[PDB]
Amino acid sequence: PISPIETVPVKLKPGMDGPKVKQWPLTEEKIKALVEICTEMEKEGKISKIGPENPYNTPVFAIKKKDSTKWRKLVDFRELNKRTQDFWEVQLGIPHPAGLKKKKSVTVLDVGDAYFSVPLDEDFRKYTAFTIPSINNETPGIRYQYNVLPQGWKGSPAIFQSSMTKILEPFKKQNPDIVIYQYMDDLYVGSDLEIGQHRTKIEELRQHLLRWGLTTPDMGYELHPDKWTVQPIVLPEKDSWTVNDIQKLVGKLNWASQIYPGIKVRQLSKLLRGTKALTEVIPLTEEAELELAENREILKEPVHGVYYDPSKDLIAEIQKQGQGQWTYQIYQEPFKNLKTGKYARMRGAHTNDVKQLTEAVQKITTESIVIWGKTPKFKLPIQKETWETWWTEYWQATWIPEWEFVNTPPLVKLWYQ
């Protein structure tokens, strides 16, 4: 299009070089799709081919977007983000509303295309370099860099922030109770309205954004954050117990003590005094029921001294509970949980583990965005190469959270369900 004004100068923290990150091998299918997409973007001026004097590289992937049958290009900007935006969450930083999580419904719209209009600083372009790989190393890859604000770069909405504010200004005046937060390429819109009125208002915002030149490609995607809390730990309830069941109970309670220190197991541990068969039925005493009940009412009331620290990173642990169910905890420090939850989707065996874990990660990340305005670093119960191979199949989002892989779970599986 045109440069409406000059470019916003982009800088890196002094003493920091550009991203150099190897490109993952891709299927011929994804390579072809990337070739088409990038050819079209090259014809539109969005990206340009570069020479060998550009050392930098950033990974690219091909995803199906959400429900669509056509390919989308997804650039992994995490490294460039760490090397730039960490100074740009200050200089250009976008404030995060603490009322968004309190709304009864939150709809997510994709505003990314808006970035393609605005030019990028000439000096900074070389840092956006990416490579379309070739099969079997037959040729060196096809190399491009961005001439416009790239999607996935956290600096893009930071630069486009003023324009977005100006565009959203009229809508906010006619709708003062609607909360609108911008995270990367997405717009989160909260309301207390009835589902129908909420969707009507969302379509109003869509048409408003559309008549101002901002296109958006929009069950549907909508959240309900008012139900989001830290789930209580549950003790198994049975008519008649056994030695084994009581052992499990004492174990789980003793584990829960690391969270809620005011738990006393002394009575339940006595209930089996001598060496006994695991299947031996032990009726609980009065003191045993007293202590179990005293440990129950203390376990349904949330912890003390748990607050979100903006300085520390968010950490999300996920464990596989079997039968399509997964449990997760979001925490800054060990044993202090900011959020916990459980995810399950759909049966029929059409689903597999990797798909479930991927959708779970996406959901947890979206929750974390709505709540704290930033993404947690995941600890994934999956083999590294497996994940790195199959994650782009089911990935529907425009952002990539940080992650690592955990090889050492204990029995904590059934303690979290």
Partner 1 sequence: PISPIETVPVKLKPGMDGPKVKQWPLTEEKIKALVEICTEMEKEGKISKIGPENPYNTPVFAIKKKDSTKWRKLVDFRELNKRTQDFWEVQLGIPHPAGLKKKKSVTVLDVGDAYFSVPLDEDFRKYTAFTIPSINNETPGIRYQYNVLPQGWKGSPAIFQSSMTKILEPFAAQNPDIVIYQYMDDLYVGSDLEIGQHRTKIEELRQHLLRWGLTTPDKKHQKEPPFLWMGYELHPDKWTVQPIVLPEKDSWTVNDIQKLVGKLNWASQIYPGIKVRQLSKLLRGTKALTEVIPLTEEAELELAENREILKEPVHGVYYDPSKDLIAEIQKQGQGQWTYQIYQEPFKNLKTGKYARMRGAHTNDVKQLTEAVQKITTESIVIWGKTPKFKLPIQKETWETWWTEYWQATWIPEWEFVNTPPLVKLWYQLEKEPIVGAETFYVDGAANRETKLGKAGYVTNKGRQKVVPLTNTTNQKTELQAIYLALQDSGLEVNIVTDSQYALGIIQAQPDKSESELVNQIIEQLIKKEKVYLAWVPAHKGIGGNEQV
CA distances from 249 to 206, 209, 254, 268 (A): 53, 56, 8, 8
Site string (136-165) toward partner 1, x via CB under 8 A? xxxxx--x----------------------
9-30 CB burial, b ≥16 within 10 A, e <16: ebebeeeeebbeeebeebeeeb
Task: Give, as ranges, the residues between 176 and 215 that touch partner 1 (CB under 8 A).
Answer: none
- Residue 282 CA, distance from chain mean position: 46
Which pair of structure tokens corresponds to residue 217?
């490609």
251 binds partner 1 (CB under 8 A): yes
Residue 76 known to bind ligand:
no
Site string (10-39) toward partner 1, x via CB under 8 A? ---------------xxxx--x--------
261 binds partner 1 (CB under 8 A): no
345 binds partner 1 (CB under 8 A): no
Least CB distance to partner 1 at residue 55 (A): 4
67 binds partner 1 (CB under 8 A): no
Number of residues in contact with partner 1, rule: CB under 8 A?
55
Shortest CA distance to 364 belongs to which of 334, 328, 400?
328
**Residues 6 or more apart from 112 whose CB is under 8 A from it?**
151, 184, 185, 186, 398
CA distances from 234 to 258, 340, 417 (A): 15, 13, 7
Q: Which of 216, 231, 244, 351 binds partner 1 (CB under 8 A)?
A: 244
Q: Which of 10, 148, 265, 364 binds partner 1 (CB under 8 A)?
A: 265
Site string (287-326) toward partner 1, x via CB under 8 A? --------------------------------xx-x----
Q: Which of 102, 270, 300, 345 binds partner 1 (CB under 8 A)?
A: 270
Q: 265, 250 in Cβ contact below 8 A? A: yes
Considering only 108-116, 179-187, 298-306, 383-391, which stretch makes contact with partner 1 by CB under 8 A?
A: 383-391
Shortest CA distance to 404 belongs to which of 369, 368, 385, 377?
377
Q: 182, 94 in Cβ contact below 8 A? A: yes
**Residues in the site for partner 1, rule: CB under 8 A?**
25-28, 31, 51-55, 57, 135-140, 143, 242, 244, 247, 250-251, 254, 265, 269-270, 272-279, 319-320, 322, 352-354, 356-357, 380-383, 385-386, 389-390, 409-411, 413
